[PDB]
Design a protein around this ligand. Structure first.
Ligand SMILES: [Mg+2]
Ligand SMILES: [Mg+2]
Ligand SMILES: [Mg+2]
Ligand code: NA
Ligand code: NA
Ligand code: NA
Ligand code: NA
Ligand code: NA
Ligand code: NA
Lengths: 173, 173, 173, 173, 173, 173
């Protein structure tokens, strides 16, 4: 049953990796939903749409890298349902950015718990995988989203549709 | 409630489009599972893995095009859970190709039902959308997968691991 | 006696580095032996030979990087005899790949023990050195060798000399 | 009061980062002093001057990267006075190199203490930040300075003004 | 004690140059503080941050040129502590620009006093050094900052966060 | 048991080739030791280090060519332990060059004995192999090392650390 390549890879780490794969795919689905919300004719913020679509693809890449990790270590991928996002209607550019920030912080928390598990299981390869490919990415993404939220709020979003328009043009464009 | 752009777009067509979006995302997920099955150290068919990963990305593109359609017509996207694939272990290159063929034919059947609905609702734009972007793509994909299955079987798959190896090299490579 | 550059570098870490240097040089020697086994007129698998020669040179590079590390930290290199490999005759492409896999996993285990020692001695520089330059390299090498072994076995190695021939051509060539 | 981006960032880590920022700015100031010492007409070692000026700019870059880190994590930068260097007159190329070596080892010790704090606070992002951007840089800088000191001493510095002259030309030039 | 190069260089001029060096380094530190204030996630005005970082580096260059002057004339550099800036929190783009304007005018006043001292000591080289490299630079910087302050105020800064946003984009970007 | 390619290849020649392979690998190991001795922070002669590392790689190449010869003639490679070098600490650039000269002359003597054996066994292919690839290489290497030793001694090595420094720069650099 044991993979010929498997070495120093705890069952709990394998399971946590599978959970993280699902979470990354979920985040990719959330961002896809947000993108096409901004593609609606009654919202019509193309650069918001582009931004979130890019994020969706990035999240898919993160999931695929975790799957590659899983196979590299000799764990076995078990996929689960990708739950639909919490919203169909994301209400505003600002609200979407706030939800994205919340999502990214939740993903970061899951990564931190993964790192803690790796450390506890004395899995330095896994620890450094997480550190190299995920943790800084998360910190950067959270910082960027926080900057966006700050700018939108200062501009007067979401009540100032001019605010969101000009943010779409000048920041995301 | 009615979109300012909506014209000649029946509620039943909108719902069928949402169902098709989910089905395309499901197909993407299935192909992703198959790809990383072939990435396992105990399977190790890199070109199978690459082939199915490409298919996964293509299916995601198809889903995104349907979402774009939905917004273009003034329908509203409602996402649903993406169900996990039927298998974790796809057993062989031949079996994966057979399951892919079955999946593609099911997707094609759903597209044909969508076309029939469009026709019944006198939606020529939707009909020609399906015809232009989906139906021929499906016919081609089904033909390609059938060719692959035929070749693998004639080569002696899945019992001939040499068969699958050489197919991976010479057809998919 | 203490090096002017030495800081936070435990004697046990220095000794473990010297042991790792010897182990990497040993691995280089093993791969050299395997390469020239495949260069024999009665074996004559040129791409196996090339593959293992490349591995030999890579292992030498790993040893040299450890020696550089040793000097960077102000430890002192103490070389030991490089023991001859366990075999003169490696029997088959498959057997050589299996022995290489075993060797790489042993090297990985030694690296993991080195990391554990570094961590216990609160040597984050050493830990991150190992993580950055060695651990992922090992995981990748083990995964690659496992893939090779899997393919050879499925093809019918080592009894199918056609198997090894075609693997030599299509995978290693 | 809490930053919207802040996550898993302990107050003690934030304070230690502020201390490190000050220390890096101090090191920059020290190197600036040394550079312009070597620019004096009665010292006139242009390549020493260039070397230390480069080091000064590098140290400022390190400080700026720590400030960026601070903002990325949602900590708040609090700057302090940059103390003047211990010397106005650095006496000789050899003495300046010895003081630089001492400074770099002190900076390294502060970084190691920072890493220990990060580890104790279970801040893997901070740990890997320090490891990636600072610790190896320090090890390299210390090794280089030790090499310089060794060469100068063997050449006969600081009593051999010919020694320092030729070192300036051939090593630093 | 007297430098072999020293000629027509009064002790009072040497001391005033040392004071100016400290003042330029102080200005550099102030601009650095402002830059990283604008890099905060709750301020998030990247082009303000870039503008002030550029100013910081420019001020450092000015200090280094004064040190070079000091050595060229045969005076001796005596560095002092670089005091921390008056603020940690610069409140707004407009407020930062107003403080920068005040700082630049103070630096200009110090330069004018330096020029007056040079003139009184019949040091035409020093006078023309100040005139060529510093005075026009100051006049330009003050004019630019005044223009910025005027624009921000007319736009409605600092109460109009849209004002600061659009200024950041269109003037500083 | 006899190789299909073997012709006019005496068992004694095969054994002598195996001994020469071991000797070349030993020489490679010696040069590696010397290189990293010069990489020490308390020795710090980078061009000595580079010179000996190049020699190490060259010696490995010589060993690999002998192994290739062995297989070409249908002999069988039997590897032995590579003994550690006689020294951990090579004391000086001059001493390392003197030891290298001694090593190269010992290798040359072994090659001459190999040639004599080949001649006695009427193996003109082996004789011309040795002549073409090894003997002139040895003569050149010995001449070069003798030149180096002569220069170092005339310069005042090893007591003149300036001597070794300038030799490192101007001859080996
Ligand atoms: Mg790390
Ligand atoms: Mg003038
Ligand atoms: Mg505008
Ligand atoms: Na992600
Ligand atoms: Na599709
Ligand atoms: Na290795
Ligand atoms: Na630094
Ligand atoms: Na200035
Ligand atoms: Na040789």
């Amino acid at each position: 049953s044991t993979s010929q390549v498997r070495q120093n890879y705890h069952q709990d780490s394998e399971a946590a990796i599978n959970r993280q794969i699902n979470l990354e795919l979920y985040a990719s689905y959330v961002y896809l939903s947000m993108s096409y919300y901004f593609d609606r004719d009654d919202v019509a913020l193309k650069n918001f749409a582009k931004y979130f679509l890019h994020q969706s693809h990035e999240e898919r890449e993160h999931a695929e890298k975790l799957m590659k990790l899983q196979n590299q270590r000799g764990g076995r991928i078990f996929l689960q349902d990708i739950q639909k996002p919490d919203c169909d209607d994301w209400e505003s550019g600002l609200n979407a950015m706030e939800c994205a920030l919340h999502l990214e912080k939740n993903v970061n928390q899951s990564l931190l718990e993964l790192h803690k598990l790796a450390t506890d299981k004395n899995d330095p390869h896994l620890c450094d995988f997480i550190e190299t490919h995920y943790l800084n990415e998360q910190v950067k993404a959270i910082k960027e989203l926080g900057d966006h939220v700050t700018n939108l709020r200062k501009m007067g979003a979401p009540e100032s549709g001019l605010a969101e328009y000009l943010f779409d043009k000048h920041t995301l464009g």
